[PDB]
Amino acid sequence: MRECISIHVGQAGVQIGNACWELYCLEHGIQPDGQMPSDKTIGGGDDSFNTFFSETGAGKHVPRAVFVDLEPTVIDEVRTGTYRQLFHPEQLITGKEDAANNYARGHYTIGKEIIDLVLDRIRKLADQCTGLQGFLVFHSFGGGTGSGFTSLLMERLSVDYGKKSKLEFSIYPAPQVSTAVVEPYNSILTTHTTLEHSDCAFMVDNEAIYDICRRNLDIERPTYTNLNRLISQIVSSITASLRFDGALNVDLTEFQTNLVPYPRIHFPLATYAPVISAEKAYHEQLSVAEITNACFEPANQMVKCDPRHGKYMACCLLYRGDVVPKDVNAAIATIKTKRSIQFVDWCPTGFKVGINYQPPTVVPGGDLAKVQRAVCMLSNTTAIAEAWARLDHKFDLMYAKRAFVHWYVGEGMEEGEFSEAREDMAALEKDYEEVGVDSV
Amino acid sequence: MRECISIHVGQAGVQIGNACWELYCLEHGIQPDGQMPSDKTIGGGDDSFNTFFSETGAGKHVPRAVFVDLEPTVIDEVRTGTYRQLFHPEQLITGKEDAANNYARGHYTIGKEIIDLVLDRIRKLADQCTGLQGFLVFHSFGGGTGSGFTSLLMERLSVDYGKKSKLEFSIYPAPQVSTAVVEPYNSILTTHTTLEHSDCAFMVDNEAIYDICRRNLDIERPTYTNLNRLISQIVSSITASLRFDGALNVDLTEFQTNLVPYPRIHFPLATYAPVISAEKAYHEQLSVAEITNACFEPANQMVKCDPRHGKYMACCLLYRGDVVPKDVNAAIATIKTKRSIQFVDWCPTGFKVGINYQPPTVVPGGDLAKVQRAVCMLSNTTAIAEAWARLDHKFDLMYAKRAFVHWYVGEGMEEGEFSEAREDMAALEKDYEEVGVDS
Amino acid sequence: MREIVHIQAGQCGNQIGAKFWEVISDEHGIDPTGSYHGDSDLQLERINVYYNEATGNKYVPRAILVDLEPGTMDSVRSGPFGQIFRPDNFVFGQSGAGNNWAKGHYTEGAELVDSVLDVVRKESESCDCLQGFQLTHSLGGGTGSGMGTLLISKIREEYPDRIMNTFSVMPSPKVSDTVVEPYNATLSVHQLVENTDETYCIDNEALYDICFRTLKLTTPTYGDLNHLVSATMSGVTTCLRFPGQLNADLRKLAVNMVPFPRLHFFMPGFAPLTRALTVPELTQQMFDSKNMMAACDPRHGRYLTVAAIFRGRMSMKEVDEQMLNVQNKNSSYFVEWIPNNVKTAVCDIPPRGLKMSATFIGNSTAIQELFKRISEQFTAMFRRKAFLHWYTGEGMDEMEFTEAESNMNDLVSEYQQYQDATAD
Amino acid sequence: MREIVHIQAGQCGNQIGAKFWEVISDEHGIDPTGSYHGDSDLQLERINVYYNEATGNKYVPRAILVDLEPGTMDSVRSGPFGQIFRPDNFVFGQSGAGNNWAKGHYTEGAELVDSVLDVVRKESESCDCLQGFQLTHSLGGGTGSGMGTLLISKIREEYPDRIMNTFSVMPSPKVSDTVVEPYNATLSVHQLVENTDETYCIDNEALYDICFRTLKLTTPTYGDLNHLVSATMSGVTTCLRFPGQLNADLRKLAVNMVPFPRLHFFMPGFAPLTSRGSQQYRALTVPELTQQMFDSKNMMAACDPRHGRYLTVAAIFRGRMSMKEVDEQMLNVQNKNSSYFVEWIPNNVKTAVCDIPPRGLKMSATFIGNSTAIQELFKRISEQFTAMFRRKAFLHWYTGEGMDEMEFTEAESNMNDLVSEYQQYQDA
Ligand SMILES: CC[C@]1(O)C[C@@H]2CN(CCc3c([nH]c4ccccc34)[C@@](C(=O)OC)(c3cc4c(cc3OC)N(C)[C@H]3[C@@](O)(C(=O)OC)[C@H](OC(C)=O)[C@]5(CC)C=CCN6CC[C@]43[C@@H]65)C2)C1
Ligand SMILES: Nc1nc2c(ncn2[C@@H]2O[C@H](COP(=O)(O)OP(=O)(O)OP(=O)(O)O)[C@@H](O)[C@H]2O)c(=O)[nH]1
Ligand SMILES: Nc1nc2c(ncn2[C@@H]2O[C@H](COP(=O)(O)OP(=O)(O)OP(=O)(O)O)[C@@H](O)[C@H]2O)c(=O)[nH]1
Ligand SMILES: Nc1nc2c(ncn2[C@@H]2O[C@H](COP(=O)(O)OP(=O)(O)O)[C@@H](O)[C@H]2O)c(=O)[nH]1
Ligand SMILES: Nc1nc2c(ncn2[C@@H]2O[C@H](COP(=O)(O)OP(=O)(O)O)[C@@H](O)[C@H]2O)c(=O)[nH]1
Ligand SMILES: [Ca+2]
Ligand SMILES: [Ca+2]
Ligand SMILES: [Mg+2]
Ligand SMILES: [Mg+2]
């Protein structure tokens, strides 16, 4: 049991959803038709992968997922793509008219027409679970559907499932692939509204992923396909703890007890390694020590911040592949000594480590190399605020001249909600500062 | 003819009691099945031995004894031992859980649920007596049942047999074999409470028996069986005058008269000689003079103390075997000049002497060599007060921090009953001090 | 699908309207008979936006043609692709307009507007998901400018939540001497400010100046001007007609381009104007005042927002870099209080003939030069009460003319007020 | 028969519980199927202290297995002696407790607790003369910690006059890395101070040191840690399971080891320290045993005894050996460290010998000390707790389950009282 339902919202959520589910199928040996020849328990079972895949009588393994978008063209690609047979039609939900990059339209005007249906389809999945753990919500900050509809859905999930946990995979907007001047408004609006409905939220900064793909993968002009594929390896490492079984493995629930000290401080920073091209992987075997020492390089982080100019409140290292406890220990030592790791006074301990012996995997036709071992670090640092800050600034620069707000008010929104948000965000920036202040 | 009922309380009492009755049998020629060929009156008698054994129409001689322990393990041994047919089930009383080395649990908690049963069984034996003289009570100071239950029983026996003598055999706690850190507590509690109800108490310090076994018997690590076989030699010597024809200490009352001028100072020191290893290859048979001298060596006392620095109020010499009056009187005058034997002014400097011609019987396969003559000295000397001082100092050490006191208070005892029992012992030490303060 | 309903009213509206359908039909591979005969599936992915797919695999423009004087309509029906249109969508009058805005808007235009509305309604009800509307017209004549805006106002009542998009041709004395134009333009601009969502200002002054100075065609004809218009219209609708992620529909464009409701008048630009040129050259030219389809110098104002659209095979890396250079090198001319306000689309299908082209859509405060020039003229006639007869004749009042005067003054004031504003 | 009811709760409780039952089953000549197969009748004399007898002359451990998650049980069930346990005595849930004391004690735990008490009650009504209960659990998690202490409290209510004994594994950041363990531990010590008669403090910090420093196990596993716990648990329960005169039942042990009600936390010790798999070429001399068991390096709690004073000590020697020499060496130790035993509890060191040795060892010794130095263990936990609690860090995990912060303040307070009370008697 302990199932997890995935909800992919808007283009980013959906496109990222495709990449993850493809990766999951590769990892568990599931084919595009849903058959998994290595699974004897036909029709049903209690295996680890069943937390993400349900089983039909015919032996099909169906993702515990829902795809939702306010227009059809992105999800149509799933309906016709290699994995179309993988999903039951009721899992792919589409409307006719999108939010037009307007939080207001996704939350109110358009969202209101399709929200009931989405919740019903989610109810049908939940009802198939013997022990529903929680939800995983993938969505962009900047789109009207990613922002406006997500927040509506999270409010409605809080009502229908109470305190059942909700984790968020959020695409933080970056100029290099942004599609709307208003993405800051949508980002602050969506973050405020979901802040109290979300238990833990993993931001991915598109500028950070863009830069890593150029530098580490030598991609001159990364596409969404480049980004979504690296973004997936992070999700797979946060989820592997639940999709695979092992002796040194740790469930995300234990990590969360350590990665969320206070209710609102629920935004961990993610780092993956090794991100290398086959051209450079050839003639190079990144050691457990090198990969770990990389998770502390301020340029291999999926959110642009300087972890050093701040204090750590938790560093959780989830390893995968040819890793053995002895090597992990030596590494953490070398790092602590020859590196800048300052923890807070209120955090006895500080490091949590785990190993998933299931090897790392790479999609045929990818730009990442098949390594024998990899590491994902989830760290709660007071430096993630450099992101809330930068975004908050863009917002304050436009709201002062009240730019583009006529589009939001024309759909019902009021200036108040725009200020109610800036204040929760100023509070969070203070909260992150106070959590680092030493004690008396 | 007057009977004696024996009462054995707790493990010490039962195992020591079990030792004595076997030795009584070997001394009187009573077989394990209760048949006594020597007995020629079948089904009855008023012989000296009838004071301890009653008779049946089937010729069975059964001890006039009652065993009581709050746990069955120890009494089970009696029920399956080699002398199981001697006793009948009604005189073997056991409980379910014991006093857990807690005087309060033995006295109040577990005592109250069994006191009336024990007294009933004792009444049943008592009604079969034509002239009950009283009781001999065997128990430890340190156990919860031996200390806590005994005091209750002693009290009830004074109520239901107000007109009877009560003798005690008391095992005094020694570290070498003790099993609870709280034994000094239990020791002072039971002494305080039984003190007014006991006419004469024989204290046996396990420490003394432990070292005598080591030194004289070559026993590397004496067990209870070793200790108890020696103890039965002493107990038997003291009660010999009740079970055989004679004229010294012939009834319980005579013990108090001869040994106990003061009611509260009723703790005579016992000394026994000679103790010879049975594994020894023949030994210089000691003379009357030699064993009489041995009675004034600390190393043969049942309580280590130094009678030189105290005063006598009474002395009884009990000889068994090849002893005649001339040699005793000639040994006494010798000792009286060689050794410092100082009686209290208000007391005649003199010895009451008793000879039993039957020599000591030794249990086949025991550690003690058979001898032709032995002697047990009973001396009421103030030197025995040393054992109260030692005991009381340990009590004071623990009580000052109230260590372990909560175990007793939890069983319904009040804290006040500690300092009260201690006060009585404070008074008892001063009584010894007054009676023996010449120097 | 996401349908747009095209309406062209008047000579200019129907002339550039007709040229528009030729260019984009060609790009999608639709012949005059409605049959598709093209080589790439990209031409059909979003063809429903402008075309209805009827039975017989024939594509018919979703276009309504309107005019108060036939013949122009007749020439259009005879011109290339004339038979591709639906005959019921021809809706024309008789009385004409006589270059009189009042006749197009209050009298002659009104007595025909109901006939037009039935065609619009029919076309809209057929739509799976109506995007909104797209009108082509001039502001100097009578039908296009007068009936055109009346038509918008009537549409807005029935489709209040749809996008209203207009390609509007501004009058230049360099190209027309009807004298009354500045009246019809000003009364037209007054209406566009309130009732349209986004308006492309196609300034005849710029087309003439490009044909004369740049293209070197002394005494140029309407056909020459409309080659720039058709080029331009094709450019600014590229992202609406092909698969893409940026400004793929009229509302997303409006959200990126219109920061304040009234400031919705866009400056179009095109490069190259017609040897082939590189991506750096393409970028430099499209931001140069001489490639603007509106008589305005962008160095004389600041950009509120810009969309750039590159068409053809080229290095996307090269495009991104060159775009950053031009924003940085020209940082002073972008308002700092709208971060990241220049978006860039790249459609890999070039238009017919060129190997790559750039199209510029600017919301610049310098467009007040276009309104100021019209305003100057308007006042240079209304100050004498000249020709007030044609308009009062049809019963219009004194005020109206004045309200349009101050209303457009305000518009110029707002563009200025946000040009001078600072981030701190 | 003076029966004991054994309860094991949670992951650690069941893992060390199961190994305990495997170790003593072997010692008592019972096999995986519950059949007696021994050479001595000494093994069967008190077999009923821990085992029930059915038809088939089979022996069934008087043991209840409790957990809030379905794993662990499966693990125990498939373990070598998985089949000896009574099936009706497996009581488990599906939610789990998420290493959260509040979930074990108040919410998830409460749903399962009643069905546990029936099986406890079922087992107790079967006993002729029930001594009381013993529970194995850790204090750092949620089930053993939170639900474990709930079970103690509820069981005490039904049997207030029986001995309650626990084997309580103290958390150490050397062995685990879950940040809330000091919260769960402090909450649990507060319970144990109030509701148990005797607690053996088994400290994972010392188990780690023994394995890593003394036994040179550079990749220690919980299997390694539990090898020492099981050796220690067989040793400290020897007086209950074999004929003997000293500490032969739980109540007599409490009267000898617990001079003041709250001071009922024992330091276990064991000698020789051995790592499983290895073989013993030379046994140790009674002298060596005696020197070692009093050595700080052989204690199962990570506290230096030389930093405090012993109130009471029990020593249990197992194996064929000179009773004379044991006495001599125990006297030497007391006479040699006579300043480390309080002077106001005379003869506070008690010594036992049992002829049956434990599997694999010819000679062993187990130390049970009530030493005031146990305060260092509770101080360590206390320091970790305050570092977080003074900022209310991670508290939402507990308040979200209905707990108030006042209840944390009390647990810290009670534990600081306990520490200072040990300090009181150290200066006597
Ligand atoms: C007996 C139970 C145990 O096996 C004991 C340790 C922890 N786990 C087993 C697995 C394990 C260990 N280390 C791992 C690293 C990655 C993945 C798995 C492991 C374990 C080991 O090295 O194998 C023998 C181990 C773990 C630690 C460990 C030692 C250790 O090996 C014994 N340390 C005691 C701590 C540690 O934090 C510390 O305080 O330094 C001593 C330590 O720091 C370093 C750099 O050594 C370290 C090592 C990863 C760092 C961060 C997290 N903390 C928690 C405990 C600590 C660890 C062994 C449970
Ligand atoms: N990393 C990543 N970001 C994406 C992807 N798709 C969109 N985005 C980002 O998402 C933001 C815009 O949100 P979208 O997902 O495009 O839009 P939407 O959520 O569908 O909302 P509407 O368009 O209003 O319906 C921009 O910052 C994009 O860069 C994707 O596949 N990967
Ligand atoms: N000489 C001798 N001393 C004994 C014997 N048994 C116990 N003792 C001593 O007596 C004290 C303990 O008294 P026990 O008889 O065990 O106690 P109990 O009467 O059984 O009391 P509980 O069992 O605690 O209720 C200790 O000092 C023992 O050393 C025995 O057989 N002989
Ligand atoms: N670019 C361009 N401008 C035109 C065209 N026809 C007319 N105009 C302009 O439009 C204005 C006259 O509009 P007109 O078409 O007569 O309006 P109508 O009476 O409503 O149909 C003049 O200022 C011309 O400059 C054309 O084909 N192309
Ligand atoms: N010595 C030992 N400690 C253990 C074992 N299993 C878990 N622990 C410790 O117990 C604590 C975790 O408790 P856990 O058993 O998961 O608690 P639960 O959630 O109530 O089942 C941590 O401090 C671990 O180090 C074991 O088998 N042996
Ligand atoms: Ca299966
Ligand atoms: Ca007779
Ligand atoms: Mg979308
Ligand atoms: Mg007893």
Numbering used by the authors:
A (entry chain C): 1 to 440
B (entry chain A): 1 to 439
C (entry chain D): 1 to 42, 45 to 276, 284 to 360, 369 to 441
D (entry chain B): 1 to 42, 45 to 360, 369 to 438
Question: What did the article's authors report about this structure?
Answer:
Here, we describe a multi-reservoir, high viscosity extruder as a step towards automation of sample delivery at XFELs. In two commissioning beamtimes at the SwissFEL Alvra endstation, we validated the general performance of the multi-reservoir extruder and determined 13 structures overall.
Third, we demonstrate efficiency gains in ligand-soaking experiments for structure-based drug design (SBDD) approaches by solving the structure of the anticancer target tubulin in complex with both small molecules (some of which are approved chemotherapeutics) and with new photochemical affinity switches for the optical control of tubulin function. These reservoirs (loaded simultaneously into the multi-reservoir extruder) were sequentially measured without disrupting the low-pressure helium environment of the Prime chamber and without entering the beamline experimental hutch.
